[PDB]
């Protein structure tokens, strides 16, 4: 990692182009070069390049993913003083926290939502019921009622948790990694459900992100679903649409899991102290969260000045509603190996070399395989065994003090 300068990786579907002008405006200023990157699968390799001093000074992704990077020692912890910390709002540093320690600067706030083309579809459907019986209509017009991204189960996950599947059981603000309800009946309901579109013909089992992105683009598809970062090019092409909740199933909202965007210092890096300027004072500010949200919109920023202005906006609103009805991501370090198993799952029941039960069982149990973990309380003189953790600051406890010891609340840590 070279000395005197930044270098910043950001997944390619954000507005690196406008970090990227948040960068020459800290190098006009100090004459610090700033290089912004955009890798592929950055997730993955940064902590390929992290474990031997290498990689980025600064690491963009969803918040999800940090505490397995923060568990292999790979990320600085941050040091805000209180009068930063009020400058954003506490819902965002709740999810960067880990291990009671902050270890990334929230960013923004992303949902998922059910985006629809208003002269189409007038009164986009409120159930995913009506979906197959709306498409079949839409059919006799030469257009169809709804393609989204297949591939990543990010995008099917608020379907298949709406009838109540889940990753870890969640309780009084803790998870158990040992109860996952990944083959439940909730689960298998919701994806069975899916992929009886794709058997009538309602949707086609290989949809990716360009494939569904290009034909709601060109008008030819209705609905789709998509993030905030969707926007840029909803709107550069001349589609009139509008975004609201995603879909009911079986009465039960559907439930998206909630991303706060984070950006991370690497462990390594000689500059953390000009990571910390760059991010504290110019990213994190009204001027410098207007520009990259004007590249590719980032939903609802971190920053509570530049959010009272965005708050207005009716897809911000919209994202806010289905953001209320999903749930936040866990960051423990067993949420990749759960993102891993379920997009397995979901590509195989959607293109038929699984059945629904068959490729949820498989994910189920590969998953909690790779789920040993010992509470932090200190005056165990021994590492004690758990599977719980509290949610808050994402720190184990065991089964005794989860019970017995008052310490962690939902409501307050
Ligand atoms: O598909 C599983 C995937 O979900 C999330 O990735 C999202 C990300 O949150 C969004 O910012 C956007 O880039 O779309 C991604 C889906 O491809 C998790 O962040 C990620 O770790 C997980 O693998
Ligand atoms: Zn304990
Ligand atoms: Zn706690």
Request: charged residues 20%.
């Given at each position: 990692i070279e000395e005197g300068k930044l270098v910043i990786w950001i997944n390619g579907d954000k507005g690196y182009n406008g970090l990227a002008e948040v960068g020459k405006k800290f190098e006009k200023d100090t004459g610090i070069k700033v290089t912004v990157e955009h890798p592929d699968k950055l997730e993955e390799k940064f902590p390929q390049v992290a474990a031997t001093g290498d990689g980025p000074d600064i690491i963009f992704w969803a918040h999800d993913r940090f505490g397995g990077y923060a568990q292999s020692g790979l990320l600085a912890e941050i040091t805000p003083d209180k009068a930063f910390q009020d400058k954003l709002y506490p819902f965002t540093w709740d999810a960067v926290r880990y291990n009671g320690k902050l270890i990334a600067y929230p960013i923004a706030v992303e949902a998922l939502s059910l985006i629809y083309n208003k002269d189409l579809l007038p009164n986009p459907p409120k159930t995913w019921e009506e979906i197959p019986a709306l498409d079949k209509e839409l059919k006799a017009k030469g257009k169809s009622a709804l393609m989204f991204?297949?591939?990543?189960?990010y995008f099917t996950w608020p379907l298949i948790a709406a009838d109540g599947g889940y990753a870890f059981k969640y309780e009084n603000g803790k998870y158990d990694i040992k109860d996952v309800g990944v083959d439940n009946a909730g689960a298998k309901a919701g994806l069975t459900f899916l992929v009886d579109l794709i058997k009538n013909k309602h949707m086609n089992a290989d949809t990716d992100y360009s494939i569904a992105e290009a034909a709601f683009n060109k008008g030819e598809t209705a609905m789709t679903i998509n993030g905030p970062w969707a926007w840029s090019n909803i709107d550069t092409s001349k589609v009139n649409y509008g975004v609201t909740v995603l879909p009911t199933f079986k009465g039960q909202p559907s439930k998206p899991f909630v991303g706060v965007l984070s950006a991370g210092i690497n462990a390594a890096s000689p500059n953390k102290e000009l990571a910390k300027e760059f991010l504290e004072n110019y990213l994190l500010t009204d001027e410098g969260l207007e520009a990259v949200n004007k590249d590719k919109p980032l939903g609802a920023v971190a920053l509570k000045s530049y959010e009272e202005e965005l708050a207005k906006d009716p897809r911000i609103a919209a994202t806010m509603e289905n953001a209320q009805k999903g749930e936040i991501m866990p960051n423990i370090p067993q949420m990749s190996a759960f993102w891993y198993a379920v997009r397995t799952a979901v590509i195989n029941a959607a293109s038929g070399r699984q059945t629904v039960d068959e490729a949820l069982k498989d994910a189920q149990t590969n998953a909690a395989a790779e789920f040993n973990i010992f509470c932090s309380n200190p005056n165990h003189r021994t590492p004690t065994l758990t599977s719980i953790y509290c949610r808050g600051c994402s720190k184990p406890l065991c089964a005794s003090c989860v019970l017995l010891?008052?310490?962690?609340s939902e409501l307050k840590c």
């Open positions: 991204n297949l591939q990543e189960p010891d008052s310490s962690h």
